[PDB]
């Protein structure tokens, strides 16, 4: 199934995707 | 924080974008 | 982390990015 | 298309946004 909760590596990948070259608070 | 907003609950693109920079 | 978006992870990425608007990849909400 | 761009290779946010409604 598709999980709409973002946990672990899926949360980390999601930050890469949405922030892009910005990087983020957890970089 | 991010864990409660996005893992426990479901977060939006904009909420996730608040952790950028 | 795996940076590729495949399978259920590609559908989830679209849910996240496109929001409730939907998308052309699959007829989800 | 989007599988080649984002699954086989790595895609940016703009590339996924091209598929949105």
Curated annotation (Swiss-Prot), chain A:
Locate the transmembrane regions by residue number: none
Origin: domain of life = Eukaryota
Name-wise, this protein is Insulin B chain
**Protein's organism:** Homo sapiens (Human)
Gene symbol here is INS
Q: Which residues of the full protein are shown?
A: 25 to 51 of 110
From Swiss-Prot, chain C:
Query: What is this protein's record name?
Result: Insulin B chain
Question: Which source organism?
Answer: Homo sapiens (Human)
Please give the range of the full-length protein represented by this chain. 26 to 54 of 110
